[PDB]
């Protein structure tokens, strides 16, 4: 009977509703706004986690680490543009050497 | 000659692109971005859009020229413009 | 006493890679990411409501904010998921 | 394609570059600059019409452009 289950989500619709109400965003919060927002957040984390799991699998590992998150983000142009001004701790850099270097 | 042209342009403030061509360009971009519903444009909306575009382009040219000088040239190249966009970094250069 | 989206991120991870785990630091990064995106979208929706002299943040502001913040292909599927969820929710 | 992007003429682009202080301009700079201006306008116009149709309007207002620029990180002042 939870709103998350009723909407088919794994993210907490009630918690998002409370955060919207308590965050000084507007006086009132519609009923579908937390549902929409939770769905969007769940979709975004699903995308990131899928790419990161693939990056970890390609490294022959079964645990995602900040390095894998960084590899997943900086290799998808959409996510790379979304998280443009974001620094990931312990993420390193992409293995990119200029072409004039390698002889 | 170019020197007096630069000195004359850098003390003026009027827009350098022609309003009607700019308006046509903006409108055709808008109709490419539409979802089957056409829009109108306040005269001030197009002036605002053109004031921002020209300022953006002028600043971009200033940056690109610094790159030209760094390379030892006095002639601005497309690679100097492309690199200035890359250093500005995906939101300021775009 | 300190609420975290760790359990939900872990559920989504189990859905998408049923046999992969996630480190604690990576989970903290995922929590930072969710909070950051939530704040972005909510702030934009607030600004929209204030621009239109409205006092309510509805699912229409969330959709428009998603369209403004997310790059194109991301935003398409994001609004797909959002409208799908609100339909499934109002259908009950 | 025939026009509307060629409306941004070489003398106009040259005036922009001279105000920027460019002393000497190559010939491929014109096509480069038309492309840059196009991609700049596409980003701002998209957001402007997004605002404009979130409000249930059909006219792109100056404030819609101002909000689009402000959200993209460029604040414009003469149109409040």
């Amino acid at each position: 009977k939870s709103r998350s289950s009723r909407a088919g989500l794994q993210f907490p619709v009630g918690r998002v509703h409370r955060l919207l109400r308590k965050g000084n965003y507007a006086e009132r919060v519609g009923a579908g706004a937390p549902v929409y927002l939770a769905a969007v957040l769940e979709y975004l984390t699903a995308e990131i986690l899928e790419l990161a799991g693939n990056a970890a699998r390609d490294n022959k590992k079964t645990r995602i680490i900040p390095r894998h998150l960084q590899l997943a983000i900086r290799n998808d142009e959409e996510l790379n543009k979304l998280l443009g001004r974001v620094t990931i701790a312990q993420g390193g850099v992409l293995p990119n050497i200029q072409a004039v270097l390698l002889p | 000659g170019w020197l007096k042209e630069i000195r004359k342009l850098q003390k003026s403030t009027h827009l350098l692109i022609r309003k009607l061509p700019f308006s046509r360009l903006a409108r055709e971009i808008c109709v490419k971005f539409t979802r089957g519903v056409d829009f109108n444009w306040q005269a001030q909306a197009l002036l605002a859009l053109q004031e921002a575009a020209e300022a953006f382009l002028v600043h971009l040219f200033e940056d690109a020229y610094l790159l030209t000088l760094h390379a030892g040239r006095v002639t601005l190249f497309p690679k100097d413009v492309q690199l200035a966009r890359r250093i500005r970094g995906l939101e300021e250069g775009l | 006493r300190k609420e975290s989206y760790s359990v939900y991120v872990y559920k989504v991870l189990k859905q998408v890679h049923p046999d992969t785990g996630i480190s604690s630091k990576a989970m903290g990064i995922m929590n930072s990411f969710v909070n950051d995106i939530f704040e972005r979208i909510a702030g934009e929706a607030s600004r929209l409501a204030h621009y239109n002299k409205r006092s309510t943040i509805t699912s229409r502001e969330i959709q428009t904010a998603v369209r403004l913040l997310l790059p194109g292909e991301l935003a398409k599927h994001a609004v797909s998921e959002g409208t799908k969820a609100v339909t499934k929710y109002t259908s009950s | 394609l025939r026009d509307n992007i060629q409306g941004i003429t070489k003398p106009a682009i040259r005036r922009l570059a001279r105000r920027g202080g460019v002393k000497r301009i190559s010939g491929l700079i014109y096509e480069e600059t038309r492309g840059v201006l196009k991609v700049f306008l596409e980003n701002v116009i998209r957001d402007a019409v997004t605002y404009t149709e979130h409000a249930k309007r059909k006219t792109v207002t100056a404030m819609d452009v101002v909000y689009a620029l402000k959200r993209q990180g460029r604040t414009l002042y003469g149109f409040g």
């Binding site: 899928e50 900086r74 | 890359r86 250069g93 | 292909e73 991301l74 398409k76 | -």
Partner: peptide, 21 residues
């Protein structure tokens, strides 16, 4: 190329500073 669960092709950020034609 590379497609996710949704039909979202996640292209890699090749190059954007260069104008197209």
């Amino acid at each position: 190329s590379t497609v996710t669960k949704s039909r979202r092709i996640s292209r890699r950020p090749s190059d954007w500073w260069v104008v197209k034609s």
